[PDB]
Design a protein around this motif. Structure first.
Motif, PDB file in Angstrom:
ATOM      1  N   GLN A 293     -85.153 -79.994 -82.100  1.00  0.00           N
ATOM      2  CA  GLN A 293     -84.778 -79.907 -80.696  1.00  0.00           C
ATOM      3  C   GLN A 293     -83.972 -78.638 -80.432  1.00  0.00           C
ATOM      4  O   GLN A 293     -83.364 -78.069 -81.337  1.00  0.00           O
ATOM      5  CB  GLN A 293     -83.968 -81.135 -80.286  1.00  0.00           C
ATOM      6  N   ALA A 294     -83.964 -78.211 -79.165  1.00  0.00           N
ATOM      7  CA  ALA A 294     -83.396 -76.910 -78.805  1.00  0.00           C
ATOM      8  C   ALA A 294     -81.902 -76.842 -79.101  1.00  0.00           C
ATOM      9  O   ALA A 294     -81.402 -75.827 -79.609  1.00  0.00           O
ATOM     10  CB  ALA A 294     -83.661 -76.619 -77.329  1.00  0.00           C
ATOM     11  N   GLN A 295     -81.174 -77.914 -78.777  1.00  0.00           N
ATOM     12  CA  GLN A 295     -79.744 -77.984 -79.065  1.00  0.00           C
ATOM     13  C   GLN A 295     -79.469 -77.797 -80.551  1.00  0.00           C
ATOM     14  O   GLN A 295     -78.650 -76.953 -80.940  1.00  0.00           O
ATOM     15  CB  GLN A 295     -79.197 -79.330 -78.591  1.00  0.00           C
ATOM     16  N   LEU A 296     -80.165 -78.560 -81.394  1.00  0.00           N
ATOM     17  CA  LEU A 296     -79.957 -78.476 -82.832  1.00  0.00           C
ATOM     18  C   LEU A 296     -80.397 -77.130 -83.391  1.00  0.00           C
ATOM     19  O   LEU A 296     -79.785 -76.632 -84.337  1.00  0.00           O
ATOM     20  CB  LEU A 296     -80.700 -79.609 -83.531  1.00  0.00           C
ATOM     21  N   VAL A 297     -81.432 -76.518 -82.813  1.00  0.00           N
ATOM     22  CA  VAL A 297     -81.899 -75.232 -83.321  1.00  0.00           C
ATOM     23  C   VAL A 297     -80.882 -74.135 -83.022  1.00  0.00           C
ATOM     24  O   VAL A 297     -80.545 -73.326 -83.900  1.00  0.00           O
ATOM     25  CB  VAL A 297     -83.288 -74.899 -82.743  1.00  0.00           C
ATOM     26  N   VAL A 298     -80.361 -74.102 -81.789  1.00  0.00           N
ATOM     27  CA  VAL A 298     -79.329 -73.123 -81.450  1.00  0.00           C
ATOM     28  C   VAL A 298     -78.082 -73.349 -82.298  1.00  0.00           C
ATOM     29  O   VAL A 298     -77.473 -72.397 -82.808  1.00  0.00           O
ATOM     30  CB  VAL A 298     -79.004 -73.175 -79.945  1.00  0.00           C
ATOM     31  N   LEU A 299     -77.697 -74.617 -82.479  1.00  0.00           N
ATOM     32  CA  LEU A 299     -76.526 -74.931 -83.288  1.00  0.00           C
ATOM     33  C   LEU A 299     -76.716 -74.497 -84.736  1.00  0.00           C
ATOM     34  O   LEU A 299     -75.790 -73.964 -85.358  1.00  0.00           O
ATOM     35  CB  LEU A 299     -76.236 -76.427 -83.203  1.00  0.00           C
ATOM     36  N   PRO A 342     -96.167 -72.230 -75.408  1.00  0.00           N
ATOM     37  CA  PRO A 342     -95.948 -73.464 -74.658  1.00  0.00           C
ATOM     38  C   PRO A 342     -94.580 -73.464 -74.020  1.00  0.00           C
ATOM     39  O   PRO A 342     -93.653 -72.778 -74.493  1.00  0.00           O
ATOM     40  CB  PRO A 342     -96.073 -74.553 -75.734  1.00  0.00           C
ATOM     41  N   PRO A 343     -94.393 -74.214 -72.924  1.00  0.00           N
ATOM     42  CA  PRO A 343     -93.165 -74.042 -72.120  1.00  0.00           C
ATOM     43  C   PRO A 343     -91.877 -74.470 -72.813  1.00  0.00           C
ATOM     44  O   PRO A 343     -90.882 -73.733 -72.765  1.00  0.00           O
ATOM     45  CB  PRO A 343     -93.457 -74.888 -70.873  1.00  0.00           C
ATOM     46  N   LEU A 344     -91.856 -75.648 -73.443  1.00  0.00           N
ATOM     47  CA  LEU A 344     -90.621 -76.144 -74.047  1.00  0.00           C
ATOM     48  C   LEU A 344     -90.173 -75.256 -75.201  1.00  0.00           C
ATOM     49  O   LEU A 344     -89.004 -74.849 -75.275  1.00  0.00           O
ATOM     50  CB  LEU A 344     -90.813 -77.586 -74.518  1.00  0.00           C
ATOM     51  N   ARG A 345     -91.096 -74.920 -76.100  1.00  0.00           N
ATOM     52  CA  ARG A 345     -90.731 -74.032 -77.192  1.00  0.00           C
ATOM     53  C   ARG A 345     -90.488 -72.611 -76.708  1.00  0.00           C
ATOM     54  O   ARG A 345     -89.742 -71.878 -77.354  1.00  0.00           O
ATOM     55  CB  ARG A 345     -91.799 -74.070 -78.288  1.00  0.00           C
TER      56      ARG A 345
END
Ligand SMILES: Nc1ncnc2c1ncn2[C@@H]1O[C@H](COP(=O)(O)OP(=O)(O)OP(=O)(O)O)[C@@H](O)[C@H]1O
Ligand SMILES: Nc1ncnc2c1ncn2[C@@H]1O[C@H](COP(=O)(O)OP(=O)(O)O)[C@@H](O)[C@H]1O
Ligand SMILES: Nc1ncnc2c1ncn2[C@@H]1O[C@H](COP(=O)(O)OP(=O)(O)O)[C@@H](O)[C@H]1O
Ligand SMILES: [Mg+2]
Ligand SMILES: [Mg+2]
Lengths: 1285, 198
Positions: A293-299, A342-345
């Motif tokens: 998920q985006a939060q975990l990836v940035v973190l 794709p939009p989310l990624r």
């Protein structure tokens, strides 16, 4: 054959209705409820539409009876099922709570007994309806209307009586404090339905929109967000144990945190094994990004960078290696974004680009100076992330740190959100607020509006994994409401981001300071089963609690913070953010080859645009406008690359950005700044160009709708080009924006513009469009938004809140339609600042109740205002702006509209009236086309002076009313001469003179005698129309008769002698020239029920002339009203309560006088006198304008639109130059013509009172020779006394 | 009202007229044209209000609400909100405000005369008299950038004592061959400041 086809249509209606039965479904082996509402509602609506369709034309007169039976049967079943859906929906969750919830009879025995009675009645009605599913059979039961109304009233009564249990239930699960009472009963009652709960997780959690369930709905598999991002629980929670709703929902809340911690550990292991290599594989990187998920990836990226930098500073080669790895990852990021995704990624890649460019800048700053140890404050200042897998508590495995501030990640699932570009101003804000939070003091950024205060606070709260709530607090945020939201925040563990805190009524602010003091004292005790006393109750305090205060000092004279409260908050001043850096990072993230070049070209472009362009009250060129331009530039670049791919590639990034800039900033410009802005574009971007259009389909159906509703149309250089292009600009801003604002002088066509746009969008997209028009000044702020009862804490919805809540609930399928909410009033910071959090990207409305109403994507809140001279930058900057200049609606447009409405839509509503209307239009066309006569006379009347400020449209509508009266008079002559109809040549020579008489009494009716004589002689000099020759008598003193010639009013006034019985009776009028002229003019206005204003000095004869006019019309009843300085629309409400009655109809509720068949006219004697607010508005005048233009008002009791049936207005006033009087708004004056009645003067006074005295000196027959000198002496002394005193 | 009319006839001897001077693409030309347009509009408003107060004060003319408010403000000596459009230091008295407005209008008259005859480049303007000086500075930077075909964002400022600016005054310092020395004087008036962009 047509009659047989209509009969076949009614037979098909019979078949489809007799084959229609209510679709009942079992409700958990207890009952059988009715579902499938939308199909039934749509079928009923389209049947009623068809019934009205063949009712109008052409052979309806032969089969009226069965059609009337069908239409009122359809209205009855519509009303029954409208009540029935709400009754069933209320009963379902009420039965759910009263059954599943225990300790209710032990708590509310009378309420439980009443609900058992209600349930027995409802079940009996359900057995009755299940015996006969046929809809006509259900209609056949007598007493269904009264039974359902009693059922709904008692269900609402127990609804309001169930409120005390809700606080007790809220004390168990902390997050329930953020939902309203009705939604909370929906939650509790539907605790077993579960599928109905998916629309209330948004208000309760941060970025959770739904929960992934099983087929049997017995376990909760995981949590999904609004954007489709999903989180799957490691150990799913089971509802098959049958826990309570609070128990399993608390289990969900804990499990999402534990699962997010586990996935963060796995992801940071993945990034640890990725980051040891100097070169990375883009395929593996993209697979990992799509995996987590985006939060975990940035973190994970932040943790990896911080660990690498710490290991490098443990010890210039390692620091250079860290910078090289960061730059390699950044290049991979940029090259991956440069292609389609794709939009989310793609959003994930954008967040990673922002984070990695901030990390690259930090590493460059570290390596520019000489840093050798990890204890250096240059390294310690930036935020750092530490992850130890040895920690046995999975929640505390990550420790966010900044300079001397240890923080634990909250592990709240935030979804996606928007990562904030890390300006150095944002870095200083992060440092100061983390220092305040370490010191157990709330942060408080301040500064001008639009600098990134609440967004930076939200960004910090998201960085720490905390739950942030943005409250738009206003004057009605009381001590009790603040205490309630503080205890909710403290029990949840969520941050508070109170926005615009300084408009909070200083004494209540000082009272709030005590609660804040108690909160930080409890937090300091936590920092070393703890409680603090809030509202005389000791409540649990979570360690994650924080309070943040957003202020704009010197905004609109807001309340000053007391020194007691100022010491509890750590101030930071943010006045200017790095526009260069934010634009560069956003463009590089969206994907642009010349990102730095475009940023260096766009930010100084706005700097020069703020200064070279003119100064207007509705311009904004700040950071919000810049960010909107950047986002729209990214969107249009995506659209262009998709269009090209439909046929890597090369795209004109410069031209794309100029397209976005023009699309967003061109509509807000005045007509004189367009060449200046285009010159600025040509100077900044040399190879720029500009192309627009490609809106041919919507343009064609726009033309179709304009031709449908008697509107003129253009194609760019025709008569309608400017108006049509303004409609297209309004459509573009609706597409690319959030909340609009249409600005221009009264008579600029903006209301017609948005109406025509809405109907064109209807006909284009096939989605239904409904527009709600609200006047914000015709009601108080309490009625507009809401009111908290100080005695019992219950919330009654306001008008706008009720409309938004209805759209949110969408019981009648209102989510799928197109809802537009229009504030057709004027803007001041009393009420528009409550929409600060709505028009901003927060997308929610905040109430003192603590309940928040998100804005659905189909709702476009918009304004229709005349000027922005009393609104602030905080609400100017938040709205997309369309400027309707005064020359957009040229006068020939309105001329053509009037002529088209004359040719069609006959007045008495082929027809004889329609034929005489067409003849009149065809003989008065050359006086209306182009310059002609009316335009020259109007431009001269502008140069004349008048008792009121003359707008073009007031006198133009007045002229249209006079011409309609002329057509009615011709029809009257035709009805009076059946043997000899109206001959066309004398009709021509009659209309050709009525037009002159009407333009005279229209453009000079509100001026003095010398000015109206001047306009008469100007018309005589300018027109080729036969006029009565007289060296001295002006044309104003002549009447046009039905024969076609000019008849003087001097022959109309008789030399009457009144009897001695009535010498000075109130209703006795001796007729004079001004008296008969104003009599005929007032009759002309009142025949069409057009509202009017009688202006003039007090005692000049305004109400006497009005009553003399009204006594010649026996169909009108006059009600007198007097307006004081402190006049409020409650006076009009009381008059309507007295003389009129409210009647419910299938098409709405209407207000009509009790006297059937008569017309009620309301006489307001002092229409100027109501007190003007400090923002230049009058509540009564706005109310009257609302019900004159829209033809009705909003009932305050139930927020229901009320349409007047037989009501019209007349106004009396002193001139606005008088000391107590104030000038009326031009938007109100657009509808009401003014006639200026002056003092009679000496010559008229002499005969007026000579008649009275000649009559009065007949009681004494020896004095009748002294009447003339007596009148002369009286008039002389009256004139002498008027002159001095 | 006698001394009100006396002062009211005393003031407008320093206020006479202003022309509006329109086909030029030069940023300085268009900035000065919009500047003189704003100045002429405000001068017309002030002079019309002043004539109205003359008529209602010494003569035969009824007083409206606006005239009564204006008369009260003029009697109290506080600046009316209608006339105050440009930035005035901390609410200056009307007596000094009309003198400052006369100076600004005379300056704009000099700009109009110079534009009657690039031509507008050679003039020396006092930054105090302009209704907005930062817009003038940005327009000057734009003018030099477009006349040299240079980048807007990479232009530093070189200051000497291609545009002349008068009326700038120091605060506790003195100048000699563009050298700053600390001085005990409150304000030393710079004679003429030369601005060049490099
Ligand atoms: N394209 C058009 N062609 C002809 N007449 C038009 C056109 N657009 C508007 N009108 C006419 O303009 C008149 C006023 O326009 P509109 O109702 O939009 O008011 P408005 O400018 O929004 O005023 P307000 O400020 O009072 O809300 C109407 O009587 C309408 O018939
Ligand atoms: N550092 C930043 N990075 C990205 N966007 C920003 C930044 N600072 C401000 N913005 C944007 O500028 C706008 C500023 O709004 P803001 O000033 O936070 O509202 P308020 O005036 O209520 O505090 C927001 O739309 C925000 O998205
Ligand atoms: N043409 C007229 N003939 C007789 N009386 C008149 C005439 N015009 C005015 N009046 C006198 O003026 C009075 C009406 O003034 P009114 O309409 O009440 O003014 P306002 O409504 O502003 O108070 C009556 O008392 C009437 O006697
Ligand atoms: Mg805010
Ligand atoms: Mg309108």
């Amino acid at each position: 054959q047509g009659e047989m086809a209509l009969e076949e249509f009614l037979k098909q209606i019979r078949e489809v209705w007799n084959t229609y039965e209510l679709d009942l479904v079992n409700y958990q082996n207890k009952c059988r409820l009715i579902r499938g509402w939308d199909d039934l509602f749509n079928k009923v609506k389209e049947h009623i539409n068809s019934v009205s369709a063949m009712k109008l034309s052409p052979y309806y007169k032969v089969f009226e009876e069965d059609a009337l039976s069908w239409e009122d049967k359809l209205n009855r079943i519509m009303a029954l099922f409208d009540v029935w859906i709400d009754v069933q929906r209320r009963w379902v969750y009420l039965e759910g709570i009263f059954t599943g919830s225990a300790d209710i009879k032990h708590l509310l025995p009378v309420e439980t007994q009443r609900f058992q009675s209600i349930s027995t009645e409802f079940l009996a009605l359900m057995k009755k309806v299940s015996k006969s599913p046929l809809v006509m059979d259900v209609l056949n039961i007598q007493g269904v209307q009264r039974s359902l109304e009693r059922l709904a009233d008692l269900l609402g009564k127990i609804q309001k009586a169930l409120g005390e249990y809700l606080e007790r239930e809220r004390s168990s699960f902390p997050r329930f404090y953020f939902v309203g009472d009705e939604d909370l009963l929906e939650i509790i009652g539907n605790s077993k339905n579960v599928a109905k709960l998916q629309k209330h997780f948004k208000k309760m959690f941060a970025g959770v929109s739904s929960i992934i369930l099983n087929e049997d709905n017995s376990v909760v598999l995981g949590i999904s967000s609004r954007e489709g991002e999903e989180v799957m629980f490691k150990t799913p929670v089971s509802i098959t144990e049958h826990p309570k709703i609070n128990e399993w929902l608390t289990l969900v809340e804990k499990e999402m945190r534990v699962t997010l911690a586990k996935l963060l550990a796995e992801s940071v292991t993945e990034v640890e094994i990725f980051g040891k290599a100097t070169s990375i594989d883009p395929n593996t990187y993209i697979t990992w990004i799509d995996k987590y998920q985006a939060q975990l990836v940035v973190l994970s990226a932040q943790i990896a960078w911080s660990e690498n930098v710490e290991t490098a500073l443990s010890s210039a080669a390692p620091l250079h290696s860290v910078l090289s790895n960061v730059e390699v990852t950044l290049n991979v990021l940029a090259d991956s974004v440069l292609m389609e995704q794709p939009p989310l990624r793609r959003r994930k890649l954008e967040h990673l680009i922002t984070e990695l460019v901030h990390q690259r800048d930090v590493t460059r700053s570290l390596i520019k100076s000489k840093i050798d140890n990890a204890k250096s404050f240059e390294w310690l200042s930036q935020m750092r992330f530490y992850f130890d897998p040895k920690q046995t508590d999975v929640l505390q495995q990550l420790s966010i740190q900044m300079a001397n501030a240890k923080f634990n990640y909250g592990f709240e699932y935030l979804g996606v959100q928007d990562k904030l570009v890390q300006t150095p101003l944002t870095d200083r804000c992060y440092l100061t607020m983390t220092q305040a939070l370490e010191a157990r003091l709330g942060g408080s950024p301040f500064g001008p509006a639009g600098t990134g205060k609440t967004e930076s606070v939200k960004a910090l709260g998201h960085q720490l994994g905390r739950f942030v709530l943005v409250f738009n607090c206003d004057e009605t945020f009381d001590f009790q409401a603040m205490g309630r939201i503080f205890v909710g925040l403290c029990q949840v563990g969520a941050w508070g981001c109170f926005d615009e805190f300084n408009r909070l009524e200083e004494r209540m602010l000082s009272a709030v300071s005590q609660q804040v003091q108690c909160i930080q004292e409890a937090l300091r005790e936590h920092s070393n089963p703890i409680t603090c006393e809030l509202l005389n109750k000791q409540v649990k305090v979570s360690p994650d609690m924080a309070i943040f205060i957003t202020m704009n000092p010197g905004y609109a004279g807001r309340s000053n913070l007391p020194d007691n409260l100022k010491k509890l908050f750590r101030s930071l001043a943010m006045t200017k953010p790095d526009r260069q850096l934010i634009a560069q990072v956003m463009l590089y993230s969206q994907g642009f080859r010349t990102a730095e070049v475009l940023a260096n070209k766009i930010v100084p472009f706005f700097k020069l645009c703020d200064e070279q362009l003119s100064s207007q009250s509705h311009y904004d060129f700040g950071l919000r406008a810049l960010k909107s331009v950047l986002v729209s530039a990214g969107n249009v670049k995506r659209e262009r690359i998709q269009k090209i791919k439909r046929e890597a590639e090369n795209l004109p990034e410069q031209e794309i950005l100029i397209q976005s800039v023009c699309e967003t900033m061109v509509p807000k410009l005045v007509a004189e700044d367009i060449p200046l802005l285009f010159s600025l574009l040509s100077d900044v971007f040399p190879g720029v160009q500009y192309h627009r259009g490609e809106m041919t389909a919507l343009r064609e159906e726009l033309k179709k709708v304009c031709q449908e509703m008697y509107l003129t149309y253009g194609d760019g250089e025709e008569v309608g080009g400017m108006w049509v292009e303004k409609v297209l600009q309004l459509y573009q801003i609706t597409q690319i924006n959030h909340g609009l604002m249409m600005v221009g002088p009264s008579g600029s066509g903006k209301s017609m513009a948005w109406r025509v746009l809405l109907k064109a969008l209807e006909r284009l997209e096939g989605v239904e469009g409904v527009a709600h028009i609200i006047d914000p000044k015709a009601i108080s702020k309490d009625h507009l938004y809401g009111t908290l009862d100080p005695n019992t804490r219950e919330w009654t919805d306001g008008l706008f809140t009720h409309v938004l809540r209805k759209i949110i609930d969408s019981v009648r399928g209102e989510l799928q339609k197109r809802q537009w909410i229009v504030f057709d009033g004027d803007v001041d910071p009393e009420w528009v600042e409550n929409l600060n959090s709505v028009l901003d990207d927060n997308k929610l409305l905040t109430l003192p109740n603590g309940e928040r109403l998100s804005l659905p994507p189909n709702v476009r809140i918009m304004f229709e205002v005349q000027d922005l001279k009393y609104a602030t930058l905080a609400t100017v900057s938040r709205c997309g702006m369309v400027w309707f200049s005064e020359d957009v609606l040229s006068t020939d447009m309105i001329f053509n509209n009037f002529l088209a409405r004359l040719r069609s839509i006959p007045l008495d509503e082929a027809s004889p009236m329609l034929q005489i209307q067409r003849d009149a239009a065809t003989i008065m066309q050359p006086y209306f086309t182009s310059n002609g006569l009316v335009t020259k006379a109007l431009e001269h009347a502008f140069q004349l002076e008048h008792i009121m400020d003359l707008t073009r449209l007031r006198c133009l509508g007045s002229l249209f009313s006079m011409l309609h009266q002329a057509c009615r008079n011709v029809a009257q002559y035709n009805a009076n001469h059946p043997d000899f109809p109206m001959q066309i040549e004398q009709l021509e020579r009659y209309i050709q003179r009525y037009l002159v008489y009407a333009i005279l009494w229209s453009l000079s009716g509100d001026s003095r005698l010398k000015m109206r004589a001047e306009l008469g002689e100007y018309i005589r000099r300018i027109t080729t129309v036969p006029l009565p020759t007289a060296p001295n008598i002006p044309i104003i003193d002549y009447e046009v008769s039905i024969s076609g010639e000019w008849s003087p009013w001097q022959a109309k006034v008789p030399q009457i002698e009144v009897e001695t019985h009535k010498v000075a009776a109130p209703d006795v009028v001796v007729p004079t020239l001004d008296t008969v002229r104003h009599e005929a003019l007032l009759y002309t206005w009142l025949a069409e029920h057009k509202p009017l204003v009688l202006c003039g000095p007090p005692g000049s004869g305004k109400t006497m002339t009005l009553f003399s006019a009204l006594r010649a019309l026996p169909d009108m009843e006059v009600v007198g009203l007097n307006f004081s300085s402190a006049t409020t629309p409650e006076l009009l409400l009381k008059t309507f309560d007295h003389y009129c009655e409210y009647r419910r109809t299938p098409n709405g509720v209407v207000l009509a006088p009790v006297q059937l068949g008569k017309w009620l006219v309301l006489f307001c004697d002092e229409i100027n006198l109501p007190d003007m607010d400090k923002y230049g508005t009058q509540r009564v005048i706005s109310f009257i304008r609302q019900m004159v233009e829209h033809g009705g008002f909003y009932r305050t009791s139930d927020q229901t639109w009320v349409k007047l049936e037989r009501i019209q207005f007349v106004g009396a006033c002193n001139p606005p130059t008088d000391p107590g009087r104030k000038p009326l708004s031009h938007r109100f004056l657009r509808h009401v013509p003014v006639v200026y009645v002056d003092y009679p003067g000496p010559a008229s006074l002499t005969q007026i009172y000579g008649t009275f005295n000649r009559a009065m000196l007949r009681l004494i027959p020896s004095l009748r020779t002294y009447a003339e000198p007596l009148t002369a002496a009286m008039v002389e002394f009256y004139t002498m006394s008027q002159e001095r005193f | 009202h006698t001394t009100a009319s006396n002062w009211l006839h005393l003031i407008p001897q320093t206020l006479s007229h202003l022309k509006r001077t329109e086909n030029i693409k030069d940023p300085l030309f268009r900035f000065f044209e919009r500047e003189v347009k704003m100045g002429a509009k405000l001068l017309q408003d002030v002079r019309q209000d002043l004539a109205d107060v003359v008529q209602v004060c010494e003569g035969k003319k009824k007083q409206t609400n606006y005239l009564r408010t204006l008369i009260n403000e003029l009697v109290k000596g506080i600046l009316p909100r209608s006339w105050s459009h440009y930035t005035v230091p901390a609410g200056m008295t009307v007596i000094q405000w009309v003198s400052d407005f006369s100076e600004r209008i005379k300056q704009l008259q000099n700009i109009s005369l110079a534009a009657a005859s690039k031509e507008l480049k050679n003039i020396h303007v006092c930054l105090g008299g302009l209704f907005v000086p930062e817009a003038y500075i940005t327009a000057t930077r734009q003018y030099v950038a477009q006349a040299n075909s240079w980048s807007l964002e990479e232009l530093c400022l070189e200051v000497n004592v291609s545009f002349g600016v008068t009326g700038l005054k120091l605060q506790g310092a003195t100048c000699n061959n563009n050298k700053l020395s600390l001085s005990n004087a409150i304000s030393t008036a710079l004679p003429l400041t030369q601005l060049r962009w490099v």
